[PDB]
Amino acid sequence: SGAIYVGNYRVVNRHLATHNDWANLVWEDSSRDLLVSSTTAQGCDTIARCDCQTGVYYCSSRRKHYPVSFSKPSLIFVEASEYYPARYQSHLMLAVGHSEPGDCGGILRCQHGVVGIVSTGGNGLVGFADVRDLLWLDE
Ligand SMILES: NC(=O)[C@H]1CCCN(C(=O)Cc2cc(F)ccc2Cl)C1
Ligand SMILES: [Zn+2]
């Protein structure tokens, strides 16, 4: 669980979106595992606009933050689940680091701000759905 709040936006993993997020939909993309919904109050997260490859993510299964090097956003094959058939998930960045199914929603961030959220993982790897290209979150 976990979301990014930037202005009147709520960014969540599309597979964990609620009835409320779908009834207030702005944008959603199954290929990225992302869903953005409208909120009434103001959100104060800063989104990073950069090409950083180092940062810190929160791992809720360990109740700890961890520093990682992560790859550049790309199309990576993701094993079938109860939410999706087997497919390439776009805009994904991988890191060596601990991850568990309930860790989805944990924020990844660099000195510039929010980079993305935990979306995939397994075998000592952790995958993050990137949000730095979503320029419209700012405006
Ligand atoms: N983005 C997706 O399609 C997700 C949907 C939920 C399932 N999923 C995972 O990777 C689950 C997972 C397994 C594991 F061994 C360690 C961490 C995680 Cl996040 C793919
Ligand atoms: Zn950065």
Residue closest via CA to ligand 1's atom 15 equals: 122
Any idea where the domains of the chain sit in the sequence?
3-44, 45-139
Q: How many CB atoms neighbour CB 102 within 10 A?
A: 13
Please report the resolution in angstroms.
Answer: 1.8
Beta strands in 45-124 (DSSP E): 54-59, 64-69, 74-78, 87-96, 107-110, 113-122
- Spatial separation of the C-alpha atoms in residues 113 and 108, rounded to whole Å: 9
Q: Ligand 1 test: best mutation among 15, 33, 83, 104, most atoms within 8 Å of CB? A: 104
Q: What is the Cα–Cα distance from 105 to 35, expressed in whole angstroms? A: 12
